[PDB]
């Protein structure tokens, strides 16, 4: 998962946000 | 009326208050079993009361800061033990053989330059 941008765990990895990790 | 010991483990600090009552135990404004739910490691924090048969005899207001839930647990386990030693000085016997009065300086070791962590060295290839 950690490489998969379209997931929660994925955007935590990058340190960014979106629909798949909201702030 | 009240008995306080200071409990520390890691970054976790324990303000624990022993008071004669049913056996109710509270951490940061929640019931013990609510604040430590599913933490199998919890029930052992309330150990020193078994060292002197105190399962029902005391209530507890407890705040907690620093570390995590199991570092916070070990601090508590120290503090309620710490607090008993004042309520009854004769309780020193049957508390030292359990090592309940002693607090370990075991803390996360410094990340060292030239390493991946504190000790994990970078992998190396000769020929």
């Amino acid at each position: 998962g950690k490489g998969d941008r379209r997931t929660r765990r994925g955007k935590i990895w990058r340190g960014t946000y979106g629909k798949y990790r909201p702030r | 009326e009240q008995y306080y010991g200071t409990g520390r483990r890691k970054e976790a600090v324990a303000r624990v208050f022993l008071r004669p009552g049913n056996g109710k135990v509270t951490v940061n404004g929640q019931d013990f079993n609510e604040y430590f739910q599913g933490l199998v490691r919890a029930v052992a924090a309330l150990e020193p009361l078994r060292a002197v048969d105190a399962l029902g005899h005391f209530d507890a207001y407890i705040t907690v800061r620093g570390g995590g839930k199991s570092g916070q647990i070990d601090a508590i386990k120290l503090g309620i033990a710490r607090a008993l030693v004042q309520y009854n000085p004769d309780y020193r016997a049957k508390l030292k053989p359990l090592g309940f009065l002693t607090r370990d300086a075991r803390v996360v070791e410094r990340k060292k330059y030239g390493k991946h962590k504190a000790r994990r060295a970078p992998q190396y290839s000769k020929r």
């Binding site: - | 599913g38 933490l39 199998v40 490691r41 029930v43 052992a44």
Partner: protein, 155 residues
Amino acid sequence: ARRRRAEVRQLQPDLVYGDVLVTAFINKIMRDGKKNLAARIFYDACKIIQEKTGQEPLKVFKQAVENVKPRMEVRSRRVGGANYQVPMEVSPRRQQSLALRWLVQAANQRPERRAAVRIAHELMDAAEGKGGAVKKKEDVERMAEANRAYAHYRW
């Protein structure tokens, strides 16, 4: 190692059975320092060997432990131009370690899909003298018996 023998780490007795042996078993189950899951994984199986086998979980565990404990093993020793496999007694310390290790190892070879169940059934098979956990111990023992020829080579 070189200066003095290692000091054997005494564990914290498990909170559900006060037992220093179950705790160990937990750690060999624990991946990635996530004891909480590994604790449940064990404890669930206890409930599972409770369902299918009405007697004390801890009782099934301790007999199965005993049935995987190996009494002899061969251990390497190159005398000359060959490496001669010498048989030696297994210290009670080591028996426990290998037994607990093979229990989990054999457990994870099983096909049933959840970790709780795998532990349960292998413990069910091990206390009754079946299962891969034993298939390891029997293997290790026949290997040892096979080399009673080199038995005089003890250190």
